Amino acid sequence: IESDLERAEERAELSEGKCAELEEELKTVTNNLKSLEAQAEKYSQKEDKYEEEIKVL
Amino acid sequence: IESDLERAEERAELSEGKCAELEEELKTVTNNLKSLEAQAEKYSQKEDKYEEEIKVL
């Protein structure tokens, strides 16, 4: 039973490590998505401004 | 020892489930990020053309 307990412990440790890595990856990619969405909104506004400038000039 | 082993194995199962869910989230967010990268590239091309026309005018 002691050997069985050791095996269970090591499996749990590996699973937790993988979970932590996945958490970090998701955090990074979600931050990237947020930044890109803000940039896209600003770009739409800039595009409208540029079209207005084209018309007036 | 037997009780501790049972609890450890249950913990490992829970961690594995969490890892699977995290994998799903990561893949979904990755796809969304790629789509928005393409959108931003289109934004960049539009801005380039508008800038050129502004210069000409």
CSV table of N, CA, C and O in Angstrom, one decimal:
chain,number,residue,atom,x,y,z
A,1,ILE,N,0.8,-1.2,0.0
A,1,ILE,CA,0.0,0.0,0.0
A,1,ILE,C,0.9,1.3,0.0
A,1,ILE,O,0.5,2.3,-0.6
A,2,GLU,N,2.0,1.2,0.7
A,2,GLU,CA,2.9,2.4,0.7
A,2,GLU,C,3.4,2.7,-0.7
A,2,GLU,O,3.5,3.8,-1.1
A,3,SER,N,3.8,1.6,-1.5
A,3,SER,CA,4.2,1.9,-2.9
A,3,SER,C,3.1,2.4,-3.7
A,3,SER,O,3.3,3.4,-4.5
A,4,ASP,N,1.9,1.9,-3.5
A,4,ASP,CA,0.7,2.5,-4.2
A,4,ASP,C,0.5,4.0,-3.9
A,4,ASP,O,0.2,4.8,-4.8
A,5,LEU,N,0.7,4.3,-2.6
A,5,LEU,CA,0.6,5.7,-2.2
A,5,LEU,C,1.6,6.6,-2.9
A,5,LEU,O,1.3,7.7,-3.3
A,6,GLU,N,2.8,6.1,-3.0
A,6,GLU,CA,3.9,6.9,-3.6
A,6,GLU,C,3.5,7.1,-5.1
A,6,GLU,O,3.7,8.2,-5.6
A,7,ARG,N,3.0,6.1,-5.8
A,7,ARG,CA,2.6,6.2,-7.2
A,7,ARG,C,1.5,7.3,-7.3
A,7,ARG,O,1.5,8.1,-8.2
A,8,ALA,N,0.5,7.2,-6.5
A,8,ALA,CA,-0.6,8.2,-6.5
A,8,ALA,C,-0.1,9.6,-6.3
A,8,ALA,O,-0.5,10.5,-7.0
A,9,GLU,N,0.9,9.8,-5.4
A,9,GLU,CA,1.4,11.1,-5.1
A,9,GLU,C,2.1,11.6,-6.3
A,9,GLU,O,1.9,12.8,-6.7
A,10,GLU,N,3.0,10.8,-7.0
A,10,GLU,CA,3.7,11.3,-8.1
A,10,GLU,C,2.8,11.6,-9.3
A,10,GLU,O,3.0,12.6,-10.0
A,11,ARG,N,1.7,10.8,-9.5
A,11,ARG,CA,0.8,11.1,-10.6
A,11,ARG,C,0.1,12.5,-10.3
A,11,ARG,O,-0.1,13.3,-11.2
A,12,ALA,N,-0.3,12.7,-9.1
A,12,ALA,CA,-1.0,13.9,-8.7
A,12,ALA,C,-0.1,15.1,-9.0
A,12,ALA,O,-0.5,16.2,-9.5
A,13,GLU,N,1.2,15.0,-8.6
A,13,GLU,CA,2.2,16.1,-8.8
A,13,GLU,C,2.3,16.4,-10.2
A,13,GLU,O,2.3,17.6,-10.6
A,14,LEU,N,2.5,15.4,-11.1
A,14,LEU,CA,2.6,15.7,-12.5
A,14,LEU,C,1.4,16.4,-13.1
A,14,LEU,O,1.5,17.3,-13.9
A,15,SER,N,0.2,15.9,-12.7
A,15,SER,CA,-1.0,16.5,-13.2
A,15,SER,C,-1.1,18.0,-12.8
A,15,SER,O,-1.5,18.9,-13.6
A,16,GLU,N,-0.8,18.3,-11.5
A,16,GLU,CA,-0.8,19.7,-11.0
A,16,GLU,C,0.2,20.5,-11.8
A,16,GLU,O,-0.1,21.7,-12.1
A,17,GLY,N,1.4,20.0,-12.1
A,17,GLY,CA,2.4,20.8,-12.9
A,17,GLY,C,1.8,21.1,-14.2
A,17,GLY,O,2.0,22.3,-14.7
A,18,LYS,N,1.3,20.1,-14.9
A,18,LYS,CA,0.7,20.4,-16.2
A,18,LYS,C,-0.4,21.4,-16.1
A,18,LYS,O,-0.6,22.3,-17.0
A,19,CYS,N,-1.3,21.3,-15.1
A,19,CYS,CA,-2.3,22.3,-14.9
A,19,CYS,C,-1.8,23.7,-14.8
A,19,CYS,O,-2.3,24.7,-15.4
A,20,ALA,N,-0.7,23.9,-14.0
A,20,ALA,CA,-0.1,25.2,-13.8
A,20,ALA,C,0.4,25.8,-15.1
A,20,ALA,O,0.2,26.9,-15.4
A,21,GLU,N,1.1,24.9,-15.9
A,21,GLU,CA,1.6,25.4,-17.2
A,21,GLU,C,0.5,25.8,-18.1
A,21,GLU,O,0.6,26.9,-18.8
A,22,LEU,N,-0.6,25.1,-18.2
A,22,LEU,CA,-1.8,25.4,-19.0
A,22,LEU,C,-2.4,26.8,-18.5
A,22,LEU,O,-2.8,27.6,-19.4
A,23,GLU,N,-2.4,27.0,-17.2
A,23,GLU,CA,-2.9,28.2,-16.7
A,23,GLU,C,-2.1,29.4,-17.2
A,23,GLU,O,-2.6,30.4,-17.6
A,24,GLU,N,-0.8,29.3,-17.1
A,24,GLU,CA,0.1,30.3,-17.6
A,24,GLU,C,-0.1,30.6,-19.1
A,24,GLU,O,-0.2,31.8,-19.5
A,25,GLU,N,-0.2,29.6,-19.9
A,25,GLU,CA,-0.4,29.7,-21.3
A,25,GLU,C,-1.7,30.5,-21.6
A,25,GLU,O,-1.7,31.4,-22.4
A,26,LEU,N,-2.8,30.1,-21.0
A,26,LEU,CA,-4.0,30.7,-21.2
A,26,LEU,C,-4.0,32.2,-20.8
A,26,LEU,O,-4.5,33.0,-21.5
A,27,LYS,N,-3.4,32.5,-19.7
A,27,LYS,CA,-3.2,33.9,-19.2
A,27,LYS,C,-2.5,34.7,-20.3
A,27,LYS,O,-3.0,35.8,-20.7
A,28,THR,N,-1.4,34.2,-20.8
A,28,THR,CA,-0.7,35.0,-21.8
A,28,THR,C,-1.5,35.2,-23.0
A,28,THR,O,-1.6,36.3,-23.5
A,29,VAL,N,-2.1,34.2,-23.6
A,29,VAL,CA,-2.8,34.3,-24.8
A,29,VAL,C,-4.1,35.2,-24.7
A,29,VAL,O,-4.4,36.0,-25.6
A,30,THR,N,-4.7,35.1,-23.5
A,30,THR,CA,-5.9,36.0,-23.3
A,30,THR,C,-5.5,37.5,-23.2
A,30,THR,O,-6.2,38.3,-23.7
A,31,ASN,N,-4.3,37.7,-22.6
A,31,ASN,CA,-3.8,39.1,-22.6
A,31,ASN,C,-3.5,39.6,-24.0
A,31,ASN,O,-3.8,40.7,-24.4
A,32,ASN,N,-2.9,38.7,-24.8
A,32,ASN,CA,-2.7,39.1,-26.2
A,32,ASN,C,-4.0,39.4,-26.9
A,32,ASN,O,-4.1,40.4,-27.7
A,33,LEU,N,-5.1,38.6,-26.7
A,33,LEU,CA,-6.4,38.9,-27.3
A,33,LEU,C,-6.9,40.2,-26.9
A,33,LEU,O,-7.4,41.0,-27.8
A,34,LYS,N,-6.8,40.5,-25.6
A,34,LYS,CA,-7.3,41.8,-25.2
A,34,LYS,C,-6.6,43.0,-25.8
A,34,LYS,O,-7.2,43.9,-26.3
A,35,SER,N,-5.3,42.9,-25.9
A,35,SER,CA,-4.5,44.0,-26.5
A,35,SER,C,-4.9,44.1,-28.0
A,35,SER,O,-5.1,45.2,-28.5
A,36,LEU,N,-5.0,43.0,-28.7
A,36,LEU,CA,-5.3,43.1,-30.1
A,36,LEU,C,-6.7,43.7,-30.3
A,36,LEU,O,-6.9,44.4,-31.3
A,37,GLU,N,-7.7,43.3,-29.5
A,37,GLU,CA,-9.0,43.9,-29.6
A,37,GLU,C,-9.0,45.4,-29.4
A,37,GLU,O,-9.7,46.1,-30.2
A,38,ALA,N,-8.3,45.9,-28.4
A,38,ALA,CA,-8.2,47.3,-28.2
A,38,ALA,C,-7.5,48.0,-29.5
A,38,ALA,O,-8.0,49.0,-29.9
A,39,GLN,N,-6.5,47.4,-30.0
A,39,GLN,CA,-5.9,47.9,-31.2
A,39,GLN,C,-6.8,47.9,-32.4
A,39,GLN,O,-6.8,48.9,-33.2
A,40,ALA,N,-7.7,46.9,-32.5
A,40,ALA,CA,-8.6,46.9,-33.6
A,40,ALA,C,-9.7,48.0,-33.5
A,40,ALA,O,-10.0,48.6,-34.5
A,41,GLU,N,-10.2,48.2,-32.3
A,41,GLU,CA,-11.1,49.3,-32.1
A,41,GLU,C,-10.5,50.7,-32.5
A,41,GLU,O,-11.1,51.5,-33.3
A,42,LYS,N,-9.3,50.9,-32.0
A,42,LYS,CA,-8.6,52.2,-32.4
A,42,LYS,C,-8.4,52.2,-33.9
A,42,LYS,O,-8.5,53.3,-34.5
A,43,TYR,N,-8.1,51.1,-34.5
A,43,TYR,CA,-7.9,51.1,-36.0
A,43,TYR,C,-9.1,51.4,-36.8
A,43,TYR,O,-9.1,52.1,-37.8
A,44,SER,N,-10.3,50.9,-36.3
A,44,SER,CA,-11.5,51.3,-37.0
A,44,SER,C,-11.8,52.8,-36.9
A,44,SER,O,-12.2,53.5,-37.8
A,45,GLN,N,-11.5,53.4,-35.7
A,45,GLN,CA,-11.7,54.8,-35.5
A,45,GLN,C,-10.8,55.6,-36.4
A,45,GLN,O,-11.2,56.6,-37.1
A,46,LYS,N,-9.5,55.1,-36.5
A,46,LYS,CA,-8.5,55.8,-37.4
A,46,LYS,C,-8.9,55.7,-38.8
A,46,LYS,O,-8.7,56.7,-39.6
A,47,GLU,N,-9.5,54.6,-39.3
A,47,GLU,CA,-9.9,54.4,-40.6
A,47,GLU,C,-11.0,55.4,-41.0
A,47,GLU,O,-11.0,56.0,-42.1
A,48,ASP,N,-12.0,55.5,-40.1
A,48,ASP,CA,-13.1,56.5,-40.3
A,48,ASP,C,-12.5,57.9,-40.4
A,48,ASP,O,-12.9,58.7,-41.3
A,49,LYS,N,-11.6,58.3,-39.6
A,49,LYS,CA,-10.9,59.6,-39.6
A,49,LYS,C,-10.2,59.8,-40.9
A,49,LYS,O,-10.3,60.9,-41.5
A,50,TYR,N,-9.5,58.8,-41.4
A,50,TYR,CA,-8.8,58.9,-42.7
A,50,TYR,C,-9.7,59.1,-43.8
A,50,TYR,O,-9.4,59.9,-44.8
A,51,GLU,N,-10.8,58.4,-43.9
A,51,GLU,CA,-11.8,58.6,-45.0
A,51,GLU,C,-12.3,60.0,-44.9
A,51,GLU,O,-12.5,60.6,-46.0
A,52,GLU,N,-12.7,60.5,-43.8
A,52,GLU,CA,-13.1,61.9,-43.7
A,52,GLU,C,-12.1,62.8,-44.2
A,52,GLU,O,-12.4,63.8,-44.9
A,53,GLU,N,-10.8,62.6,-43.9
A,53,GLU,CA,-9.7,63.5,-44.3
A,53,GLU,C,-9.6,63.4,-45.9
A,53,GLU,O,-9.4,64.4,-46.5
A,54,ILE,N,-9.8,62.2,-46.4
A,54,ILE,CA,-9.7,62.1,-47.9
A,54,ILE,C,-10.8,62.9,-48.5
A,54,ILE,O,-10.6,63.6,-49.5
A,55,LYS,N,-12.0,62.8,-48.0
A,55,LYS,CA,-13.1,63.6,-48.6
A,55,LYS,C,-12.9,65.1,-48.5
A,55,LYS,O,-13.0,65.8,-49.6
A,56,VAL,N,-12.5,65.6,-47.4
A,56,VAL,CA,-12.3,67.0,-47.2
A,56,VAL,C,-11.2,67.5,-48.1
A,56,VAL,O,-11.3,68.6,-48.8
A,57,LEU,N,-10.1,66.8,-48.2
A,57,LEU,CA,-9.0,67.2,-49.0
A,57,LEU,C,-9.3,67.2,-50.5
A,57,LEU,O,-8.9,68.0,-51.2
B,1,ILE,N,-2.3,4.7,5.9
B,1,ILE,CA,-1.7,4.7,4.6
B,1,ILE,C,-2.7,4.5,3.5
B,1,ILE,O,-2.7,5.2,2.5
B,2,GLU,N,-3.6,3.6,3.7
B,2,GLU,CA,-4.7,3.3,2.7
B,2,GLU,C,-5.6,4.5,2.5
B,2,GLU,O,-5.9,4.9,1.3
B,3,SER,N,-6.0,5.1,3.6
B,3,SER,CA,-6.8,6.3,3.4
B,3,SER,C,-6.1,7.4,2.7
B,3,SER,O,-6.7,8.1,1.8
B,4,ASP,N,-4.8,7.6,3.0
B,4,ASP,CA,-4.0,8.7,2.3
B,4,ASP,C,-3.9,8.4,0.8
B,4,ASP,O,-4.0,9.3,0.0
B,5,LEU,N,-3.6,7.1,0.5
B,5,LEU,CA,-3.5,6.7,-0.9
B,5,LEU,C,-4.8,7.0,-1.7
B,5,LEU,O,-4.8,7.6,-2.8
B,6,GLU,N,-5.9,6.7,-1.1
B,6,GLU,CA,-7.2,6.9,-1.8
B,6,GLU,C,-7.4,8.4,-2.0
B,6,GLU,O,-7.8,8.9,-3.1
B,7,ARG,N,-7.1,9.3,-1.0
B,7,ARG,CA,-7.3,10.7,-1.2
B,7,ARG,C,-6.4,11.2,-2.2
B,7,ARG,O,-6.7,12.1,-3.0
B,8,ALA,N,-5.1,10.8,-2.3
B,8,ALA,CA,-4.2,11.2,-3.3
B,8,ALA,C,-4.6,10.9,-4.7
B,8,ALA,O,-4.5,11.7,-5.6
B,9,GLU,N,-5.1,9.7,-4.9
B,9,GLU,CA,-5.6,9.3,-6.2
B,9,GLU,C,-6.8,10.2,-6.7
B,9,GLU,O,-6.9,10.6,-7.8
B,10,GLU,N,-7.7,10.4,-5.7
B,10,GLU,CA,-8.8,11.3,-6.1
B,10,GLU,C,-8.3,12.7,-6.5
B,10,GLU,O,-8.8,13.3,-7.4
B,11,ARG,N,-7.4,13.2,-5.7
B,11,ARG,CA,-6.8,14.5,-6.1
B,11,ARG,C,-6.2,14.5,-7.5
B,11,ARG,O,-6.4,15.4,-8.3
B,12,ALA,N,-5.5,13.4,-7.8
B,12,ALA,CA,-4.9,13.3,-9.2
B,12,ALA,C,-6.0,13.3,-10.3
B,12,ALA,O,-5.8,13.9,-11.3
B,13,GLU,N,-7.1,12.6,-10.0
B,13,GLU,CA,-8.2,12.6,-11.0
B,13,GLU,C,-8.7,14.0,-11.2
B,13,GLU,O,-9.0,14.4,-12.3
B,14,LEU,N,-9.0,14.7,-10.1
B,14,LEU,CA,-9.5,16.1,-10.2
B,14,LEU,C,-8.5,17.0,-11.0
B,14,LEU,O,-8.9,17.7,-11.9
B,15,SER,N,-7.2,16.8,-10.7
B,15,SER,CA,-6.2,17.6,-11.5
B,15,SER,C,-6.2,17.3,-13.0
B,15,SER,O,-6.1,18.2,-13.8
B,16,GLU,N,-6.4,16.0,-13.3
B,16,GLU,CA,-6.5,15.7,-14.7
B,16,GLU,C,-7.7,16.3,-15.4
B,16,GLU,O,-7.6,16.8,-16.5
B,17,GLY,N,-8.8,16.3,-14.7
B,17,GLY,CA,-10.0,16.9,-15.3
B,17,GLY,C,-9.8,18.4,-15.6
B,17,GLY,O,-10.1,19.0,-16.6
B,18,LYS,N,-9.2,19.1,-14.6
B,18,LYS,CA,-8.9,20.5,-14.7
B,18,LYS,C,-7.9,20.7,-15.9
B,18,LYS,O,-8.1,21.7,-16.7
B,19,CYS,N,-6.9,19.8,-16.1
B,19,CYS,CA,-6.0,20.0,-17.2
B,19,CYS,C,-6.7,19.9,-18.5
B,19,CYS,O,-6.4,20.6,-19.5
B,20,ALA,N,-7.6,18.9,-18.7
B,20,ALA,CA,-8.3,18.8,-19.9
B,20,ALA,C,-9.1,20.1,-20.2
B,20,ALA,O,-9.1,20.6,-21.4
B,21,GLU,N,-9.8,20.6,-19.2
B,21,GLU,CA,-10.6,21.8,-19.5
B,21,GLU,C,-9.6,23.0,-19.9
B,21,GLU,O,-10.0,23.8,-20.8
B,22,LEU,N,-8.5,23.1,-19.3
B,22,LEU,CA,-7.5,24.1,-19.6
B,22,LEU,C,-7.0,24.0,-21.1
B,22,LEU,O,-6.9,25.0,-21.8
B,23,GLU,N,-6.8,22.7,-21.5
B,23,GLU,CA,-6.4,22.5,-22.9
B,23,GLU,C,-7.5,23.0,-23.8
B,23,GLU,O,-7.2,23.7,-24.8
B,24,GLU,N,-8.8,22.7,-23.5
B,24,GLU,CA,-9.8,23.2,-24.4
B,24,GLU,C,-9.8,24.7,-24.5
B,24,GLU,O,-9.9,25.3,-25.6
B,25,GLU,N,-9.7,25.4,-23.3
B,25,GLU,CA,-9.7,26.9,-23.3
B,25,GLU,C,-8.5,27.4,-24.1
B,25,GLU,O,-8.7,28.4,-24.9
B,26,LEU,N,-7.3,26.8,-24.0
B,26,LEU,CA,-6.2,27.3,-24.7
B,26,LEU,C,-6.4,27.2,-26.2
B,26,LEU,O,-6.0,28.2,-26.9
B,27,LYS,N,-6.9,26.1,-26.7
B,27,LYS,CA,-7.0,26.0,-28.1
B,27,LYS,C,-8.1,27.0,-28.6
B,27,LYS,O,-7.8,27.6,-29.7
B,28,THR,N,-9.2,27.2,-27.9
B,28,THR,CA,-10.2,28.1,-28.4
B,28,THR,C,-9.6,29.5,-28.4
B,28,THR,O,-9.7,30.3,-29.5
B,29,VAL,N,-8.9,30.0,-27.4
B,29,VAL,CA,-8.3,31.3,-27.4
B,29,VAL,C,-7.3,31.5,-28.5
B,29,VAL,O,-7.1,32.5,-29.1
B,30,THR,N,-6.5,30.4,-28.7
B,30,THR,CA,-5.5,30.5,-29.8
B,30,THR,C,-6.1,30.8,-31.1
B,30,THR,O,-5.7,31.6,-31.9
B,31,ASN,N,-7.2,30.0,-31.4
B,31,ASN,CA,-7.9,30.3,-32.7
B,31,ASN,C,-8.5,31.7,-32.8
B,31,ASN,O,-8.3,32.4,-33.8
B,32,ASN,N,-9.0,32.2,-31.7
B,32,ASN,CA,-9.5,33.6,-31.7
B,32,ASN,C,-8.4,34.6,-32.0
B,32,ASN,O,-8.6,35.6,-32.7
B,33,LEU,N,-7.3,34.4,-31.3
B,33,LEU,CA,-6.1,35.3,-31.5
B,33,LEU,C,-5.7,35.3,-33.0
B,33,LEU,O,-5.3,36.3,-33.5
B,34,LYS,N,-5.6,34.1,-33.6
B,34,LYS,CA,-5.2,34.1,-35.0
B,34,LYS,C,-6.2,34.9,-35.9
B,34,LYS,O,-5.8,35.6,-36.8
B,35,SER,N,-7.5,34.7,-35.6
B,35,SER,CA,-8.5,35.4,-36.4
B,35,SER,C,-8.3,36.9,-36.3
B,35,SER,O,-8.3,37.7,-37.2
B,36,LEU,N,-8.1,37.4,-35.0
B,36,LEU,CA,-7.9,38.8,-34.8
B,36,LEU,C,-6.5,39.3,-35.4
B,36,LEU,O,-6.5,40.5,-35.8
B,37,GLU,N,-5.5,38.5,-35.4
B,37,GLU,CA,-4.3,38.9,-36.1
B,37,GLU,C,-4.5,39.1,-37.6
B,37,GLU,O,-4.0,40.1,-38.2
B,38,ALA,N,-5.3,38.2,-38.2
B,38,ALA,CA,-5.6,38.5,-39.7
B,38,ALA,C,-6.4,39.8,-39.8
B,38,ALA,O,-6.1,40.6,-40.7
B,39,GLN,N,-7.3,40.0,-38.9
B,39,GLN,CA,-8.1,41.3,-39.0
B,39,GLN,C,-7.2,42.5,-38.9
B,39,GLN,O,-7.4,43.5,-39.6
B,40,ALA,N,-6.3,42.5,-37.9
B,40,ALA,CA,-5.4,43.6,-37.8
B,40,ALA,C,-4.5,43.8,-39.0
B,40,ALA,O,-4.2,44.9,-39.4
B,41,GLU,N,-4.1,42.7,-39.7
B,41,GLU,CA,-3.3,42.8,-40.9
B,41,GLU,C,-4.1,43.6,-42.0
B,41,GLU,O,-3.6,44.4,-42.7
B,42,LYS,N,-5.4,43.2,-42.1
B,42,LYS,CA,-6.3,43.9,-43.0
B,42,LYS,C,-6.4,45.4,-42.6
B,42,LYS,O,-6.3,46.3,-43.5
B,43,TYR,N,-6.5,45.7,-41.4
B,43,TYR,CA,-6.5,47.1,-40.9
B,43,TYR,C,-5.2,47.8,-41.4
B,43,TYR,O,-5.3,49.0,-41.8
B,44,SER,N,-4.1,47.2,-41.2
B,44,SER,CA,-2.8,47.8,-41.6
B,44,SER,C,-2.8,48.1,-43.1
B,44,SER,O,-2.3,49.2,-43.5
B,45,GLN,N,-3.3,47.2,-43.9
B,45,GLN,CA,-3.3,47.4,-45.4
B,45,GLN,C,-4.2,48.6,-45.7
B,45,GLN,O,-3.8,49.5,-46.5
B,46,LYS,N,-5.4,48.7,-45.1
B,46,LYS,CA,-6.3,49.8,-45.3
B,46,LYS,C,-5.6,51.1,-44.9
B,46,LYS,O,-5.7,52.1,-45.7
B,47,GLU,N,-4.9,51.1,-43.8
B,47,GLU,CA,-4.2,52.4,-43.4
B,47,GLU,C,-3.1,52.8,-44.4
B,47,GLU,O,-3.0,53.9,-44.7
B,48,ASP,N,-2.4,51.8,-44.9
B,48,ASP,CA,-1.3,52.1,-45.9
B,48,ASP,C,-2.0,52.8,-47.1
B,48,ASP,O,-1.5,53.8,-47.6
B,49,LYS,N,-3.0,52.2,-47.6
B,49,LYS,CA,-3.7,52.8,-48.8
B,49,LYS,C,-4.2,54.2,-48.5
B,49,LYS,O,-4.0,55.1,-49.3
B,50,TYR,N,-4.8,54.4,-47.4
B,50,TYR,CA,-5.3,55.7,-47.0
B,50,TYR,C,-4.2,56.7,-46.9
B,50,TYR,O,-4.4,57.9,-47.4
B,51,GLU,N,-3.1,56.3,-46.3
B,51,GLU,CA,-2.0,57.2,-46.2
B,51,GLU,C,-1.4,57.7,-47.5
B,51,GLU,O,-1.1,58.8,-47.8
B,52,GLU,N,-1.3,56.7,-48.4
B,52,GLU,CA,-0.8,57.0,-49.8
B,52,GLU,C,-1.7,58.0,-50.5
B,52,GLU,O,-1.3,59.0,-51.1
B,53,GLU,N,-3.0,57.8,-50.4
B,53,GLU,CA,-4.0,58.7,-51.0
B,53,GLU,C,-3.9,60.1,-50.4
B,53,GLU,O,-4.0,61.1,-51.1
B,54,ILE,N,-3.8,60.1,-49.1
B,54,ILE,CA,-3.7,61.4,-48.4
B,54,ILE,C,-2.5,62.2,-48.9
B,54,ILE,O,-2.5,63.4,-49.2
B,55,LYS,N,-1.3,61.5,-49.1
B,55,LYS,CA,-0.1,62.2,-49.6
B,55,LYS,C,-0.4,62.7,-51.0
B,55,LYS,O,0.0,63.9,-51.3
B,56,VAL,N,-1.0,61.9,-51.8
B,56,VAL,CA,-1.2,62.4,-53.2
B,56,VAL,C,-2.1,63.6,-53.2
B,56,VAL,O,-1.9,64.6,-53.9
B,57,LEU,N,-3.2,63.6,-52.4
B,57,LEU,CA,-4.1,64.7,-52.4
B,57,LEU,C,-3.4,66.0,-51.9
B,57,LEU,O,-3.6,67.1,-52.4
